[PDB]
Design an enzyme around this catalytic site. Structure first.
Site, short mmCIF file in Angstrom:
data_model
loop_
_atom_site.label_atom_id
_atom_site.label_comp_id
_atom_site.label_asym_id
_atom_site.label_seq_id
_atom_site.Cartn_x
_atom_site.Cartn_y
_atom_site.Cartn_z
N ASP A 1 17.79 94.98 12.98
CA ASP A 1 18.41 94.67 11.73
C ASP A 1 19.13 95.90 11.24
O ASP A 1 18.62 97.00 11.38
CB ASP A 1 17.35 94.22 10.71
CG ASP A 1 17.95 93.43 9.54
OD1 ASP A 1 19.16 93.11 9.54
OD2 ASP A 1 17.23 93.09 8.59
N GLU B 1 22.33 93.34 14.93
CA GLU B 1 22.66 92.64 13.68
C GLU B 1 23.79 93.43 13.09
O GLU B 1 23.59 94.56 12.67
CB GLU B 1 21.47 92.56 12.72
CG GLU B 1 21.74 91.83 11.41
CD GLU B 1 22.41 92.70 10.35
OE1 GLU B 1 21.78 93.64 9.84
OE2 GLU B 1 23.59 92.48 10.03
N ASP C 1 17.71 84.45 6.33
CA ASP C 1 18.25 84.89 5.02
C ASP C 1 19.19 83.86 4.33
O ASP C 1 19.59 84.10 3.19
CB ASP C 1 19.05 86.20 5.17
CG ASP C 1 18.16 87.42 5.34
OD1 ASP C 1 17.03 87.43 4.79
OD2 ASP C 1 18.60 88.37 6.02
#
Ligand SMILES: *[C@@H]1O[C@H](CO)[C@@H](O[C@H]2O[C@H](CO)[C@@H](O)[C@H](O)[C@H]2O)[C@H](O)[C@H]1O
Ligand SMILES: *[C@@H]1O[C@H](CO)[C@@H](O[C@H]2O[C@H](CO)[C@@H](O)[C@H](O)[C@H]2O)[C@H](O)[C@H]1O
Ligand SMILES: OC[C@H]1O[C@H](O)[C@H](O)[C@@H](O)[C@@H]1O
Lengths: 514, 511
Positions: B308, B355, B408
């Site tokens: 991430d 990501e 998300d």
């Protein structure tokens, strides 16, 4: 350095799209197909109108078939010369603008639904000849440009051979140059001088006609460029035996001591194989003069086109070779092609080139590696996408970026014709992948799929933009009659395709091809 | 030689598909979301059933969120440790198969439509502790494997620090380790010895619990592999301040003399995450050993791993810890490729997913490409702006992972429902849409039709669920990470869904 502050304009330091990666679309339309009164399309007003219409759609590519003089069936792929232009494409109206003909000399129009080459030649050739004659007899601006063209070395390295070959072929009643008397057959220097003297007029006219083609084509090409349209040409890998290309360069081919091909072109099996019968290149002989013949050919292709497809590109890696003796293809063998060293020599000789590899059908590992090593895009054709399973390379999900996607080529039926004969189970397969509205609009469904592809270039035949059936099919392979004749219907003008134009623009906008 | 004959087997010398280029699909589902009686999903029967179902669809990837111990809100991205596993995922029934509990000791079931972590802990922890106690008191096979795990050097370089940190945190009433008395704060050796003596039991149980997590997770992971499913993990680039990761490695972070962060993480237009930041040049000096160990643990857990906020390896936003607004910070230079050099030198071949969402700079793209990591595309972001939006299918790349949405984002149905009109009619032109009730299949299909080599769909969208099944809403602190598969929906009950996915995977060459 690691840990330290960036300059203040870091937040704005965004990746920028590479210009060479720009997505685009275009139309495949051969100029013989344009409307008009003289039995065949030409490089006059309809070409400029078509360019304006192409531009209004957002397309930025126009693909043509080879612009060489065709065989008597009309085929641009069995041309009489690899470098000359088809003089029947010369516009008579343009010649009147040039002051080489007067309006009163123009023939009565004829209706020609389809191109009949014999009819076009009888109507146009006498007038083209007359124009060429006035050009040569004049002093003045246009004459001076003929002389520059003629004495330009990159013209003369093919033009003079072509003119002499044509003069001799005209003078003699013989099947092919194999049957010519020895001094003409083997280009004895004093025989060539004797030809120049005795066929001087024919030679000067031939050259003048090539100047007129060149001039009219270059105006079309400069107009295209001003409107943001690149032109993509086409060339077969092999040239025909009865041509200047072979006759004037015998050592660059696989001919015996008498000038007869030892080996001819083809492909193996399903079938009993397929025998094309073209002479083959002596690639190691060519290696010795740094591939000069091919370098010259690409130089002429650059002169005519921004980009060029090469038909049967696989032949550069390996080619099927049949004993000329044979009447069936299955007897031959695979031989090693020149590979990347050819394109090294070309780029060294000509600079940056833009080639498209015709790489359809069953091809071997070395073909794919050669194509990738020079960065040439290959092809995808949606008409082939629905046989077999989900690994078919013609399905959009298997397309690549560096690739040209077609709905179909000049060798395939139109999309509507293809849909109409499509067997069930290829058809219901297609229905699952494509977004189909009414079946009458099946060609727009396929157009849309081509445009939605990741392939950088999408090319659509004009027949499919017009939604036409099988009667508009340009060619059916392995038939010898009824091909290369399609013309835009005399009712459909470029002033009246604005719905079609808008619809294409909407699609190109949606898929990022504007 | 040019001109000469090829060998006779030329005609059969065809291109072969590269196995590493295989098109595939998968499902994003975090194990806390599984059904069951104990208040939270676990690594028991439902994990294996799900794997069987995944396999029956033709999918060959299962993506999970970080498997670390979450914060008290349930967030796997603000974990208490970067390497430990979430012990509440341990299956009590699996412990009975191991002989550490008896069936009679299993609690009365409870209904927990959503995960309440407090409820799960009260129900499960006492029994996990009891199992861990029997394990350490025993003398057989299982005990011997605990010892191998414990003395394995690639476990102990993080596990011992983690267990001591937890023991001290348990022993002390303090906000964070910043407030600890100096000898514990700065890990004086005799203080650490005193802790071992006084919290011996706690430490041995902590370690035993990590062994049980490891064992159960490895069994899930082997079962996946036996059924042709790779598991894709996730890791946040940053770790939290109150953790063994920071405490035991202070020199590898940007802390002042007293151990307080000089600078903390975030992003500009701002958003203040507040994690400590790495001292990258300090790390440079021991060949990035902390990060290398982290990747080694990621390899142990997963076939593949997303990172991430991968952009932070090229440049990161740094806010003075002083501040409580993000806009007062500056961009700093990240370690770049030399980090991945060190990792590959240390660990070998890795499979990382970048990501790389939101506004990212040139250096991010060049770093990602330089190590050959795939980036992401998310179809929920495809319909703002124009035709150059990178999330539109015609702009996808092969070396890429395409999602309908992530954890998300809202579900596709929830997203559709709040979608504004410009964006919605834009979507209707690109997507093949039937009824609104099936909007999630329209998007699934577009993901599957992409040229991206990997397509990943959240389980919520396969189930066609609305906004109430949304896993997380960023920058909210409550109501997240709680979604569970409805107790009515069993994997025996999703054959229609299975068939429909298999049909799509077959059509787009992902089987
Ligand atoms: C690629 O090349 C082939 C020739 O090898 C072309 O074939 C067409 O033209 C020849 C000559 O007129 C004729 O024999 C075939 O029937 C016809 O298909 C293709 O058009 C090119 O795409
Ligand atoms: C990417 O990173 C962030 C933070 O690492 C995650 O954000 C979630 O978790 C944080 C911390 O618990 C919370 O503050 C955010 O609101 C929430 O979105 C993303 O989920 C990751 O994908
Ligand atoms: O949802 C939180 C997300 O915020 C931003 O888009 C970040 O670039 C990304 O790293 C993170 O996943």
């Amino acid at each position: 350095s690691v840990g330290e502050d960036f300059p203040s304009e870091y937040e704005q330091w965004l990746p920028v799209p590479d210009p060479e990666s720009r997505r685009r679309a275009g139309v495949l339309l051969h100029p013989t197909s344009f409307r008009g009164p003289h039995g065949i399309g030409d490089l006059g007003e309809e070409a400029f109108r078509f360019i304006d219409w192409l531009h209004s759609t957002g397309c930025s590519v126009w693909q043509v078939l080879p612009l060489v003089p065709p065989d008597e069936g009309g085929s641009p792929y069995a041309g009489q010369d690899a470098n000359c232009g088809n003089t029947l494409l010369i516009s008579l109206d343009e010649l009147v603008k040039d002051g080489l003909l007067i309006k009163d000399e123009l023939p009565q129009p004829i209706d020609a639904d389809s191109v009949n080459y014999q009819t076009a030649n009888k109507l146009k050739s006498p007038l083209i000849t007359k124009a060429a004659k006035r050009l040569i007899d004049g002093n003045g601006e246009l004459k001076s440009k003929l002389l520059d063209f003629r004495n330009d070395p990159s013209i003369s390295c093919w033009l003079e051979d072509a003119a002499y070959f044509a003069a001799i072929d005209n003078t003699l009643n013989a099947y092919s140059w194999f049957e010519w008397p020895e001094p003409l057959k083997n280009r004895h220097l004093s025989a060539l001088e004797a030809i120049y003297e005795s066929q001087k007029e024919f030679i000067d006219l031939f050259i003048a006609k090539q100047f007129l083609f060149q001039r009219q084509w270059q105006k079309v090409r400069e107009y295209a460029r001003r409107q943001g349209v690149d032109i993509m040409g086409d060339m077969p890998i092999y040239v025909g035996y009865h041509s200047a290309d072979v006759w004037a360069n015998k050592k660059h081919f696989l001919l015996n001591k008498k000038g007869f091909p030892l080996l001819v072109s083809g492909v193996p099996p399903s079938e009993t194989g397929q025998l094309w019968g073209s002479p083959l290149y002596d690639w190691k002989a060519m290696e010795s003069d740094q591939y000069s013949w091919w370098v010259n050919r690409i130089r002429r292709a650059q002169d005519l086109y921004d980009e060029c497809r090469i038909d049967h590109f696989r032949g550069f890696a390996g080619f099927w070779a049949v004993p000329s003796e044979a009447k069936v293809a299955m007897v031959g063998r695979w031989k090693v092609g020149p590979g990347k060293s050819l394109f090294d020599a070309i780029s060294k000789g000509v600079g940056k080139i833009k080639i498209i590899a015709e790489d359809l059908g069953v091809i071997t590992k070395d073909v794919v590696e050669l194509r990738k090593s020079i960065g040439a895009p290959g092809m995808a054709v949606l008409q082939f996408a629905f046989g077999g399973g989900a690994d078919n390379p013609h399905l959009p999900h298997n397309h690549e970026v560096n690739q040209v996607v077609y709905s179909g080529t000049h060798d395939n039926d139109t999309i509507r014709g293809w849909w109409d004969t499509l067997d069930q189970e290829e058809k219901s397969k297609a229905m699952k992948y494509l977004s189909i509205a009414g079946e009458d609009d099946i060609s727009w469904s396929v157009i849309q799929a081509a445009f939605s592809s990741t392939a950088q270039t999408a090319i659509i035949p004009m027949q499919d933009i017009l939604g036409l059936g099988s009667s508009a099919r340009m060619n059916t392979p392995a038939t010898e009659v009824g091909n290369w004749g399609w013309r835009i219907p005399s009712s459909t003008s470029f002033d009246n395709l604005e719905t079609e134009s808008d619809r294409l623009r909407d699609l190109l906008s949606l898929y990022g091809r504007l």
